[PDB]
């Protein structure tokens, strides 16, 4: 609908936390368009362009003692003190995953299918699906979405094998995620139903 | 119990 | 590698004299502050038990940002953004049975600038009732993401879309969704 060329500054303050707090970086970083310009980054200790349109501002910062004196304080002041405020939500924080499972295709027996597992609900986004065939794993064959984060502190993934079921079998999903102390287990067994 | 969070502020131009 | 990132992250855009400010968690919101109403908004709830965020210090960075992107306009001899279309996915929010209470989740990726216009469509007609909305999330390409949620009864009956607006696609995007049977 609207034709008209537009123009977008961002800027992003970032802190990235290593070994709980013991190292953290602080980075300052201002965009025009996509492009960051300038920015501050406290393992050098000054404002630095990026690119030749940030140049003025690096200098002109730069040239200010007190602006940089505070830029040297944000791993403290902005960054451990506001992973002190959230910590106990975010960094702390740990839902169940929810585990179905189900064939994708409704087909008959000795005929290919894709049994799906679904993972659904859990944080944090780290976690591991297993697939066994009777009791043996199977890498091969798993088709998997990857962890796809829902938008709203949650997570999903889909992790399907490909089978051919004979009705001899039992089929096992199995999770593992660090709100839980021991996996959860679902089972699909080979018929009809 | 209850944390402010706080804002880094962006520097004006050249 | 590192353990967490916090990014307060920040926009405006002309000449739509739009603008955010947000606080990302390893890529999910903690907050944002609605510039129209001049409070902050928790993602969730439960936030803002724990913590606070005075809202007023939020509009004066924005005016900051304003100010400075006039600059970097000039600069740039006016310069303008590329549009960047969006990709758009469509995926429930836990698996699909009949009659059982659901979520459709509309993930609108890799895109800018931050205006979207959405509308989730059931049978090819517009539903408002019980969605909700992020506001536009930052991506480390510096590019946005968003996402829009409408609860739903699966049925046979029902087919839904997500219909995507945005200034680099010709055209409407819709993405589809229907009961697998």
Redesign the interface.
Same mark, same amino acid.
């Given at each position: 609908g609207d034709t008209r060329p537009r123009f977008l500054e961002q800027v992003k303050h970032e802190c990235h936390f290593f070994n709980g707090t013991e190292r953290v970086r602080f980075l300052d970083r201002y965009f025009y368009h996509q492009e960051e310009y300038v920015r501050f980054d406290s393992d050098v200790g000054e404002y630095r362009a990026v690119t030749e349109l940030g140049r003025p501002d690096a200098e002109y910062w730069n040239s200010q003692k007190d602006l940089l004196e505070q830029k040297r304080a944000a791993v403290d002041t902005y960054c451990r003190h506001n992973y002190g405020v959230g910590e106990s939500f975010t960094v702390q924080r740990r839902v169940y995953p929810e585990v179905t499972v189900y064939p994708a295709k409704t087909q008959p027996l000795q005929h290919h299918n894709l049994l799906v597992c679904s993972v659904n609900g859990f944080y944090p986004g780290s976690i591991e699906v297993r697939w066994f065939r009777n009791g043996q794993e199977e890498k091969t064959g798993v088709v998997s979405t990857g962890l796809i984060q829902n938008g709203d502190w949650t997570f999903q993934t889909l992790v399907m094998l490909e089978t051919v079921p004979r009705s001899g079998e039992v089929y096992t999903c199995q999770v593992e995620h660090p709100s839980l102390t021991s996996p959860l287990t679902v089972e699909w067994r080979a018929s009809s139903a | +119990?209850? &944390?402010?969070?706080?804002?880094?502020?962006?520097? &004006?131009? +050249? | 590698k590192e353990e967490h990132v916090i990014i307060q992250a920040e926009f405006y855009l002309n000449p739509d004299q739009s603008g955010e400010f947000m606080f990302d968690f390893d890529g999910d919101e903690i907050f944002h502050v609605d510039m129209a109403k001049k409070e902050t908004v928790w993602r969730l709830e439960e936030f803002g038990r724990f913590a606070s965020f005075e809202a007023q210090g939020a509009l004066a960075n924005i005016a900051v940002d304003k100010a400075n992107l006039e600059i970097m306009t000039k600069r740039s001899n006016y310069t303008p953004i590329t549009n960047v279309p969006p990709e758009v996915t469509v995926l429930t929010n836990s698996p699909v049975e009949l009659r059982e209470p659901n979520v459709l989740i509309c993930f609108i990726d890799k895109f800018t600038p931050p205006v979207v216009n959405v509308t989730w469509l059931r049978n090819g007609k517009p539903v408002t009732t019980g969605v909700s909305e992020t506001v536009f999330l930052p991506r480390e390409d510096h590019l946005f993401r968003k996402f829009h949620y409408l609860p739903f009864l699966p049925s046979t009956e029902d087919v839904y879309d997500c219909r995507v607006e945005h200034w680099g696609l010709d055209e409407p995007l819709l993405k589809h969704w229907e009961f697998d049977s």
């Open positions: - | +119990s209850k &944390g402010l969070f706080r804002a880094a502020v962006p520097s &004006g131009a +050249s | -």
